[PDB]
Design a protein around this ligand. Sequence first.
Ligand SMILES: CC[C@@H](C)c1ccc(O)cc1
Ligand SMILES: CC[C@@H](C)c1ccc(O)cc1
Lengths: 223, 223
Amino acid sequence: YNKIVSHLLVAEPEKIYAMPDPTVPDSDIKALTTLCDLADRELVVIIGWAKHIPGFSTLSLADQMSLLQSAWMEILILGVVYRSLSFEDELVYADDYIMDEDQSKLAGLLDLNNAILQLVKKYKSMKLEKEEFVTLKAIALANSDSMHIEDVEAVQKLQDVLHEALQDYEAGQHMEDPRRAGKMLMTLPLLRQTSTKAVQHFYNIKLEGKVPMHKLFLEMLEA
Amino acid sequence: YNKIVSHLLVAEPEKIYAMPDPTVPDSDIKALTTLCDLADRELVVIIGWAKHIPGFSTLSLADQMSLLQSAWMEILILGVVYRSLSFEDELVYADDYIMDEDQSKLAGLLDLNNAILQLVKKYKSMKLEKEEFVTLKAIALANSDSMHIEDVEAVQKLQDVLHEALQDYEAGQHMEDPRRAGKMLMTLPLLRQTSTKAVQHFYNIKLEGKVPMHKLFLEMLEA
Ligand SMILES: CC[C@@H](C)c1ccc(O)cc1
Ligand SMILES: CC[C@@H](C)c1ccc(O)cc1
Protein backbone atom coordinates (compact mmCIF):
# COMPACT_ATOMS: atom_id res chain seq x y z
CA TYR A 1 0.00 0.00 0.00
CA ASN A 2 0.78 3.70 0.40
CA LYS A 3 4.47 4.56 0.94
CA ILE A 4 3.85 7.35 3.47
CA VAL A 5 1.82 4.92 5.58
CA SER A 6 4.62 2.32 5.38
CA HIS A 7 7.12 5.00 6.32
CA LEU A 8 5.14 6.14 9.34
CA LEU A 9 4.86 2.51 10.48
CA VAL A 10 8.63 1.91 10.50
CA ALA A 11 9.16 5.28 12.21
CA GLU A 12 6.86 4.25 15.08
CA PRO A 13 8.67 4.62 18.43
CA GLU A 14 9.22 1.79 20.87
CA LYS A 15 6.93 1.67 23.90
CA ILE A 16 8.22 3.17 27.13
CA TYR A 17 7.60 2.15 30.71
CA ALA A 18 5.89 4.29 33.35
CA MET A 19 7.95 2.91 36.26
CA PRO A 20 5.79 4.12 39.15
CA ASP A 21 8.04 4.49 42.24
CA PRO A 22 7.56 1.29 44.27
CA THR A 23 8.72 2.98 47.48
CA VAL A 24 6.02 5.66 47.34
CA PRO A 25 2.58 5.10 48.90
CA ASP A 26 -0.32 5.04 46.41
CA SER A 27 -2.09 8.39 46.28
CA ASP A 28 -3.56 10.81 43.79
CA ILE A 29 -0.24 12.68 43.88
CA LYS A 30 1.69 9.48 43.03
CA ALA A 31 -0.59 8.64 40.10
CA LEU A 32 -0.51 12.17 38.73
CA THR A 33 3.28 12.42 39.17
CA THR A 34 3.74 9.08 37.37
CA LEU A 35 1.54 10.19 34.46
CA CYS A 36 3.22 13.58 34.06
CA ASP A 37 6.65 11.97 34.18
CA LEU A 38 5.59 9.44 31.52
CA ALA A 39 4.17 12.22 29.35
CA ASP A 40 7.42 14.20 29.65
CA ARG A 41 9.45 11.26 28.33
CA GLU A 42 6.90 10.53 25.59
CA LEU A 43 7.14 14.17 24.44
CA VAL A 44 10.88 13.79 23.85
CA VAL A 45 10.12 10.75 21.71
CA ILE A 46 7.32 12.56 19.81
CA ILE A 47 9.66 15.40 18.87
CA GLY A 48 12.11 12.81 17.50
CA TRP A 49 9.31 10.99 15.69
CA ALA A 50 8.03 14.11 13.94
CA LYS A 51 11.29 14.53 11.96
CA HIS A 52 10.32 11.41 10.02
CA ILE A 53 7.09 12.96 8.72
CA PRO A 54 7.68 14.01 5.08
CA GLY A 55 8.23 17.76 4.88
CA PHE A 56 8.03 18.40 8.61
CA SER A 57 11.76 19.07 9.14
CA THR A 58 11.84 21.44 6.17
CA LEU A 59 9.49 23.79 8.08
CA SER A 60 11.01 26.61 10.13
CA LEU A 61 11.93 25.64 13.68
CA ALA A 62 9.23 28.08 14.83
CA ASP A 63 6.52 26.38 12.77
CA GLN A 64 7.71 22.93 13.88
CA MET A 65 7.35 24.05 17.48
CA SER A 66 3.98 25.74 16.85
CA LEU A 67 2.56 22.50 15.45
CA LEU A 68 3.94 20.46 18.34
CA GLN A 69 2.72 22.92 20.98
CA SER A 70 -0.79 22.72 19.56
CA ALA A 71 -0.95 18.98 18.94
CA TRP A 72 1.10 17.32 21.68
CA MET A 73 -1.79 16.18 23.87
CA GLU A 74 -3.76 14.82 20.91
CA ILE A 75 -0.72 12.76 20.00
CA LEU A 76 -0.30 11.52 23.59
CA ILE A 77 -3.97 10.62 23.85
CA LEU A 78 -4.04 8.80 20.48
CA GLY A 79 -1.20 6.67 21.85
CA VAL A 80 -3.06 5.64 25.01
CA VAL A 81 -6.19 5.01 22.96
CA TYR A 82 -4.37 2.72 20.52
CA ARG A 83 -2.61 0.78 23.31
CA SER A 84 -6.01 0.25 24.93
CA LEU A 85 -7.94 -1.20 21.97
CA SER A 86 -7.63 -4.86 23.06
CA PHE A 87 -8.73 -4.06 26.63
CA GLU A 88 -12.09 -3.35 28.26
CA ASP A 89 -12.78 -0.26 30.39
CA GLU A 90 -9.04 0.08 31.14
CA LEU A 91 -6.48 2.57 29.82
CA VAL A 92 -3.02 1.31 28.94
CA TYR A 93 -0.88 4.35 29.66
CA ALA A 94 2.04 1.90 29.64
CA ASP A 95 2.52 -1.87 29.85
CA ASP A 96 3.27 -1.34 33.56
CA TYR A 97 0.59 1.30 34.13
CA ILE A 98 -2.94 0.24 33.28
CA MET A 99 -5.75 2.29 34.81
CA ASP A 100 -9.17 0.89 35.66
CA GLU A 101 -12.21 2.80 36.93
CA ASP A 102 -11.16 2.53 40.58
CA GLN A 103 -7.66 3.88 39.85
CA SER A 104 -9.10 6.69 37.76
CA LYS A 105 -11.35 7.72 40.66
CA LEU A 106 -8.38 7.60 43.04
CA ALA A 107 -6.37 9.85 40.71
CA GLY A 108 -9.19 12.37 40.24
CA LEU A 109 -9.32 11.43 36.56
CA LEU A 110 -12.68 9.66 36.27
CA ASP A 111 -14.21 12.21 33.89
CA LEU A 112 -11.09 12.52 31.71
CA ASN A 113 -10.45 8.79 31.49
CA ASN A 114 -14.09 8.13 30.68
CA ALA A 115 -13.76 10.59 27.78
CA ILE A 116 -10.66 8.79 26.55
CA LEU A 117 -12.58 5.52 26.86
CA GLN A 118 -15.25 7.04 24.59
CA LEU A 119 -12.52 7.45 21.93
CA VAL A 120 -11.42 3.86 22.50
CA LYS A 121 -14.99 2.63 22.09
CA LYS A 122 -15.39 4.40 18.76
CA TYR A 123 -12.09 3.14 17.31
CA LYS A 124 -12.91 -0.40 18.49
CA SER A 125 -16.17 -0.33 16.55
CA MET A 126 -14.28 0.89 13.47
CA LYS A 127 -11.55 -1.74 13.91
CA LEU A 128 -8.80 0.90 13.87
CA GLU A 129 -5.61 -0.48 12.27
CA LYS A 130 -2.04 0.43 13.21
CA GLU A 131 -1.65 1.90 9.70
CA GLU A 132 -4.58 4.19 10.38
CA PHE A 133 -3.40 5.10 13.88
CA VAL A 134 0.04 6.31 12.77
CA THR A 135 -1.44 8.29 9.87
CA LEU A 136 -4.00 9.91 12.17
CA LYS A 137 -1.21 10.89 14.59
CA ALA A 138 0.57 12.69 11.75
CA ILE A 139 -2.66 14.31 10.53
CA ALA A 140 -3.44 15.54 14.05
CA LEU A 141 -0.02 17.20 14.15
CA ALA A 142 -0.42 18.91 10.76
CA ASN A 143 -4.05 19.87 11.42
CA SER A 144 -3.57 21.23 14.92
CA ASP A 145 -4.82 24.79 14.20
CA SER A 146 -2.00 26.80 15.76
CA MET A 147 -2.59 30.55 15.55
CA HIS A 148 1.13 31.26 15.18
CA ILE A 149 2.09 29.69 11.84
CA GLU A 150 4.52 31.56 9.60
CA ASP A 151 4.29 29.52 6.39
CA VAL A 152 0.59 28.68 6.11
CA GLU A 153 0.90 27.30 2.57
CA ALA A 154 3.63 24.84 3.63
CA VAL A 155 1.57 23.60 6.57
CA GLN A 156 -1.39 23.15 4.21
CA LYS A 157 0.85 21.14 1.91
CA LEU A 158 1.78 18.94 4.89
CA GLN A 159 -1.90 18.40 5.72
CA ASP A 160 -2.57 17.57 2.09
CA VAL A 161 0.30 15.07 1.80
CA LEU A 162 -0.89 13.16 4.88
CA HIS A 163 -4.57 13.36 3.94
CA GLU A 164 -3.73 11.97 0.51
CA ALA A 165 -1.88 9.12 2.24
CA LEU A 166 -4.99 8.26 4.27
CA GLN A 167 -7.25 8.55 1.21
CA ASP A 168 -4.97 6.30 -0.84
CA TYR A 169 -4.59 3.74 1.94
CA GLU A 170 -8.34 3.44 2.41
CA ALA A 171 -9.04 3.29 -1.34
CA GLY A 172 -6.67 0.34 -1.69
CA GLN A 173 -7.23 -1.54 1.55
CA HIS A 174 -10.89 -0.88 2.25
CA MET A 175 -12.80 -0.95 -1.03
CA GLU A 176 -15.82 -2.30 0.85
CA ASP A 177 -16.29 1.12 2.48
CA PRO A 178 -15.74 4.08 0.12
CA ARG A 179 -16.27 6.44 3.06
CA ARG A 180 -13.78 4.96 5.52
CA ALA A 181 -11.17 7.75 5.14
CA GLY A 182 -13.84 10.32 5.93
CA LYS A 183 -15.06 8.31 8.90
CA MET A 184 -11.50 8.36 10.20
CA LEU A 185 -11.27 12.13 9.77
CA MET A 186 -14.64 12.47 11.56
CA THR A 187 -13.06 11.03 14.72
CA LEU A 188 -10.72 14.03 15.02
CA PRO A 189 -13.26 16.39 16.70
CA LEU A 190 -13.65 14.01 19.67
CA LEU A 191 -9.84 13.70 19.86
CA ARG A 192 -9.57 17.51 19.93
CA GLN A 193 -12.30 17.77 22.59
CA THR A 194 -10.74 15.13 24.82
CA SER A 195 -7.26 16.65 24.48
CA THR A 196 -8.55 20.05 25.49
CA LYS A 197 -10.21 18.46 28.55
CA ALA A 198 -6.85 16.92 29.47
CA VAL A 199 -4.78 20.07 28.97
CA GLN A 200 -7.20 22.15 31.06
CA HIS A 201 -7.18 19.60 33.88
CA PHE A 202 -3.43 19.26 34.04
CA TYR A 203 -3.00 23.00 33.77
CA ASN A 204 -5.05 23.26 36.97
CA ILE A 205 -2.90 20.59 38.58
CA LYS A 206 0.13 22.68 37.58
CA LEU A 207 -1.36 25.75 39.27
CA GLU A 208 -2.12 23.89 42.51
CA GLY A 209 1.58 23.08 42.79
CA LYS A 210 1.27 19.70 44.53
CA VAL A 211 2.49 17.62 41.58
CA PRO A 212 6.10 17.92 40.35
CA MET A 213 6.48 18.39 36.60
CA HIS A 214 9.49 18.29 34.31
CA LYS A 215 10.68 21.05 31.98
CA LEU A 216 9.41 19.87 28.58
CA PHE A 217 5.97 18.91 29.92
CA LEU A 218 5.71 22.28 31.66
CA GLU A 219 6.74 24.10 28.49
CA MET A 220 4.06 22.34 26.41
CA LEU A 221 1.47 22.90 29.12
CA GLU A 222 2.32 26.62 29.31
CA ALA A 223 2.20 27.13 25.54
CA TYR B 1 -25.76 18.19 -7.99
CA ASN B 2 -26.50 16.07 -4.92
CA LYS B 3 -30.17 15.96 -3.84
CA ILE B 4 -29.48 16.03 -0.09
CA VAL B 5 -27.43 19.20 -0.59
CA SER B 6 -30.26 20.78 -2.63
CA HIS B 7 -32.71 19.75 0.07
CA LEU B 8 -30.66 21.27 2.87
CA LEU B 9 -30.39 24.51 0.87
CA VAL B 10 -34.16 24.95 0.50
CA ALA B 11 -34.63 24.04 4.18
CA GLU B 12 -32.28 26.86 5.24
CA PRO B 13 -34.02 29.17 7.75
CA GLU B 14 -34.55 32.86 7.22
CA LYS B 15 -32.20 35.21 9.06
CA ILE B 16 -33.41 36.68 12.34
CA TYR B 17 -32.73 40.04 13.90
CA ALA B 18 -30.94 40.63 17.21
CA MET B 19 -32.96 43.75 18.12
CA PRO B 20 -30.73 45.12 20.88
CA ASP B 21 -32.91 47.23 23.23
CA PRO B 22 -32.42 50.86 22.14
CA THR B 23 -33.50 52.18 25.54
CA VAL B 24 -30.78 50.30 27.42
CA PRO B 25 -27.32 51.81 27.94
CA ASP B 26 -24.47 49.95 26.21
CA SER B 27 -22.67 47.63 28.62
CA ASP B 28 -21.23 44.15 28.79
CA ILE B 29 -24.53 43.03 30.33
CA LYS B 30 -26.50 44.50 27.39
CA ALA B 31 -24.29 42.81 24.79
CA LEU B 32 -24.37 39.46 26.56
CA THR B 33 -28.14 39.67 27.11
CA THR B 34 -28.67 40.51 23.42
CA LEU B 35 -26.52 37.56 22.31
CA CYS B 36 -28.18 35.05 24.64
CA ASP B 37 -31.62 36.22 23.57
CA LEU B 38 -30.64 35.87 19.90
CA ALA B 39 -29.23 32.39 20.55
CA ASP B 40 -32.46 31.35 22.30
CA ARG B 41 -34.54 32.29 19.26
CA GLU B 42 -32.05 30.69 16.86
CA LEU B 43 -32.28 27.43 18.87
CA VAL B 44 -36.04 27.27 18.27
CA VAL B 45 -35.34 27.64 14.55
CA ILE B 46 -32.57 24.99 14.62
CA ILE B 47 -34.90 22.45 16.20
CA GLY B 48 -37.40 23.13 13.39
CA TRP B 49 -34.65 22.93 10.77
CA ALA B 50 -33.38 19.55 11.96
CA LYS B 51 -36.68 17.81 11.04
CA HIS B 52 -35.78 18.38 7.39
CA ILE B 53 -32.56 16.35 7.66
CA PRO B 54 -33.21 12.92 6.07
CA GLY B 55 -33.73 10.32 8.78
CA PHE B 56 -33.45 12.71 11.71
CA SER B 57 -37.16 12.70 12.64
CA THR B 58 -37.28 8.91 12.48
CA LEU B 59 -34.87 8.80 15.46
CA SER B 60 -36.33 8.50 18.96
CA LEU B 61 -37.18 11.83 20.58
CA ALA B 62 -34.44 11.08 23.12
CA ASP B 63 -31.78 10.62 20.43
CA GLN B 64 -32.98 13.72 18.58
CA MET B 65 -32.54 15.71 21.77
CA SER B 66 -29.17 14.09 22.57
CA LEU B 67 -27.81 15.14 19.17
CA LEU B 68 -29.15 18.67 19.56
CA GLN B 69 -27.85 19.05 23.12
CA SER B 70 -24.37 18.08 21.97
CA ALA B 71 -24.26 20.05 18.73
CA TRP B 72 -26.27 23.23 19.31
CA MET B 73 -23.35 25.60 19.82
CA GLU B 74 -21.45 24.24 16.82
CA ILE B 75 -24.53 24.93 14.73
CA LEU B 76 -24.89 28.46 16.16
CA ILE B 77 -21.22 29.21 15.57
CA LEU B 78 -21.24 27.86 11.99
CA GLY B 79 -24.06 30.31 11.33
CA VAL B 80 -22.15 33.36 12.59
CA VAL B 81 -19.07 32.19 10.71
CA TYR B 82 -20.95 31.87 7.42
CA ARG B 83 -22.68 35.27 7.81
CA SER B 84 -19.25 36.80 8.41
CA LEU B 85 -17.40 35.50 5.33
CA SER B 86 -17.72 38.72 3.29
CA PHE B 87 -16.54 40.89 6.21
CA GLU B 88 -13.14 41.63 7.75
CA ASP B 89 -12.38 41.20 11.46
CA GLU B 90 -16.10 41.58 12.29
CA LEU B 91 -18.66 38.97 13.36
CA VAL B 92 -22.15 39.16 11.89
CA TYR B 93 -24.25 37.73 14.71
CA ALA B 94 -27.19 39.35 12.90
CA ASP B 95 -27.70 41.99 10.20
CA ASP B 96 -28.37 44.45 13.04
CA TYR B 97 -25.65 43.13 15.36
CA ILE B 98 -22.15 43.15 13.93
CA MET B 99 -19.30 42.93 16.43
CA ASP B 100 -15.87 44.46 15.85
CA GLU B 101 -12.79 44.14 18.07
CA ASP B 102 -13.77 47.08 20.28
CA GLN B 103 -17.27 45.68 20.89
CA SER B 104 -15.84 42.25 21.61
CA LYS B 105 -13.53 43.74 24.25
CA LEU B 106 -16.46 45.65 25.77
CA ALA B 107 -18.49 42.43 25.99
CA GLY B 108 -15.66 40.40 27.52
CA LEU B 109 -15.61 38.24 24.40
CA LEU B 110 -12.27 39.15 22.81
CA ASP B 111 -10.77 35.66 23.15
CA LEU B 112 -13.92 33.84 22.02
CA ASN B 113 -14.60 36.12 19.07
CA ASN B 114 -10.99 35.91 17.96
CA ALA B 115 -11.35 32.11 17.93
CA ILE B 116 -14.50 32.39 15.83
CA LEU B 117 -12.60 34.75 13.53
CA GLN B 118 -9.96 32.01 13.13
CA LEU B 119 -12.74 29.76 11.75
CA VAL B 120 -13.86 32.55 9.43
CA LYS B 121 -10.31 33.02 8.16
CA LYS B 122 -9.96 29.34 7.32
CA TYR B 123 -13.30 29.10 5.48
CA LYS B 124 -12.49 32.30 3.56
CA SER B 125 -9.27 30.76 2.28
CA MET B 126 -11.21 27.65 1.22
CA LYS B 127 -13.95 29.73 -0.43
CA LEU B 128 -16.68 28.00 1.60
CA GLU B 129 -19.92 27.72 -0.43
CA LYS B 130 -23.46 27.87 0.95
CA GLU B 131 -23.90 24.26 -0.23
CA GLU B 132 -20.94 23.24 1.88
CA PHE B 133 -22.04 25.30 4.88
CA VAL B 134 -25.49 23.71 5.14
CA THR B 135 -24.05 20.21 4.71
CA LEU B 136 -21.43 20.86 7.39
CA LYS B 137 -24.16 22.07 9.77
CA ALA B 138 -25.98 18.76 9.30
CA ILE B 139 -22.77 16.74 9.66
CA ALA B 140 -21.90 18.59 12.88
CA LEU B 141 -25.30 17.61 14.27
CA ALA B 142 -24.95 13.93 13.33
CA ASN B 143 -21.31 13.76 14.42
CA SER B 144 -21.70 15.52 17.74
CA ASP B 145 -20.43 12.63 19.93
CA SER B 146 -23.21 12.52 22.53
CA MET B 147 -22.58 9.90 25.22
CA HIS B 148 -26.30 9.18 25.58
CA ILE B 149 -27.34 7.71 22.23
CA GLU B 150 -29.80 4.80 22.23
CA ASP B 151 -29.66 3.72 18.58
CA VAL B 152 -25.96 4.02 17.69
CA GLU B 153 -26.36 2.25 14.33
CA ALA B 154 -29.10 4.69 13.22
CA VAL B 155 -26.98 7.71 14.17
CA GLN B 156 -24.08 6.19 12.23
CA LYS B 157 -26.38 5.79 9.25
CA LEU B 158 -27.27 9.49 9.55
CA GLN B 159 -23.58 10.44 9.61
CA ASP B 160 -22.99 8.24 6.59
CA VAL B 161 -25.89 9.68 4.58
CA LEU B 162 -24.65 13.25 5.13
CA HIS B 163 -20.99 12.37 4.59
CA GLU B 164 -21.92 10.70 1.30
CA ALA B 165 -23.75 13.89 0.33
CA LEU B 166 -20.61 15.96 0.95
CA GLN B 167 -18.41 13.44 -0.89
CA ASP B 168 -20.75 13.39 -3.88
CA TYR B 169 -21.11 17.16 -3.99
CA GLU B 170 -17.35 17.68 -3.98
CA ALA B 171 -16.73 14.94 -6.57
CA GLY B 172 -19.13 16.64 -8.98
CA GLN B 173 -18.52 20.31 -8.28
CA HIS B 174 -14.84 20.37 -7.40
CA MET B 175 -13.00 17.92 -9.64
CA GLU B 176 -9.95 20.20 -9.49
CA ASP B 177 -9.42 19.18 -5.85
CA PRO B 178 -9.99 15.47 -5.15
CA ARG B 179 -9.38 16.14 -1.45
CA ARG B 180 -11.83 18.99 -0.91
CA ALA B 181 -14.42 16.89 1.01
CA GLY B 182 -11.71 15.78 3.41
CA LYS B 183 -10.45 19.34 3.81
CA MET B 184 -13.99 20.32 4.78
CA LEU B 185 -14.19 17.52 7.35
CA MET B 186 -10.78 18.62 8.71
CA THR B 187 -12.31 21.97 9.72
CA LEU B 188 -14.61 20.24 12.23
CA PRO B 189 -12.02 19.95 15.06
CA LEU B 190 -11.59 23.74 15.20
CA LEU B 191 -15.40 24.13 15.17
CA ARG B 192 -15.64 21.69 18.10
CA GLN B 193 -12.85 23.50 19.98
CA THR B 194 -14.39 26.93 19.48
CA SER B 195 -17.86 25.71 20.47
CA THR B 196 -16.52 24.23 23.68
CA LYS B 197 -14.82 27.56 24.45
CA ALA B 198 -18.17 29.31 23.96
CA VAL B 199 -20.22 26.88 26.05
CA GLN B 200 -17.74 27.07 28.94
CA HIS B 201 -17.73 30.87 28.86
CA PHE B 202 -21.48 31.25 28.78
CA TYR B 203 -21.87 28.60 31.45
CA ASN B 204 -19.76 30.83 33.69
CA ILE B 205 -21.90 33.82 32.78
CA LYS B 206 -24.93 31.72 33.76
CA LEU B 207 -23.39 30.97 37.16
CA GLU B 208 -22.57 34.62 37.86
CA GLY B 209 -26.28 35.41 37.50
CA LYS B 210 -25.96 38.93 36.08
CA VAL B 211 -27.25 38.08 32.61
CA PRO B 212 -30.89 36.98 32.10
CA MET B 213 -31.34 33.84 30.01
CA HIS B 214 -34.40 32.21 28.49
CA LYS B 215 -35.61 28.65 29.07
CA LEU B 216 -34.42 26.84 25.93
CA PHE B 217 -30.95 28.46 26.01
CA LEU B 218 -30.64 27.56 29.69
CA GLU B 219 -31.71 23.98 29.01
CA MET B 220 -29.08 23.54 26.27
CA LEU B 221 -26.44 25.19 28.41
CA GLU B 222 -27.25 22.91 31.36
CA ALA B 223 -27.20 19.72 29.27
C1 LIG C 1 -1.14 14.83 31.25
C2 LIG C 1 -0.71 13.72 30.31
C3 LIG C 1 -1.46 12.42 30.62
C4 LIG C 1 -2.96 12.63 30.41
C5 LIG C 1 -0.97 11.49 29.71
C6 LIG C 1 -1.67 11.26 28.53
C7 LIG C 1 -1.18 10.36 27.61
C8 LIG C 1 0.02 9.69 27.85
O1 LIG C 1 0.48 8.81 26.93
C9 LIG C 1 0.73 9.93 29.03
C10 LIG C 1 0.23 10.83 29.96
C1 LIG D 1 -23.86 32.07 23.65
C2 LIG D 1 -24.32 32.09 22.21
C3 LIG D 1 -23.58 33.17 21.42
C4 LIG D 1 -22.08 32.86 21.41
C5 LIG D 1 -24.09 33.10 20.13
C6 LIG D 1 -23.42 32.35 19.17
C7 LIG D 1 -23.94 32.25 17.89
C8 LIG D 1 -25.13 32.88 17.57
O1 LIG D 1 -25.63 32.76 16.31
C9 LIG D 1 -25.82 33.62 18.54
C10 LIG D 1 -25.30 33.73 19.82
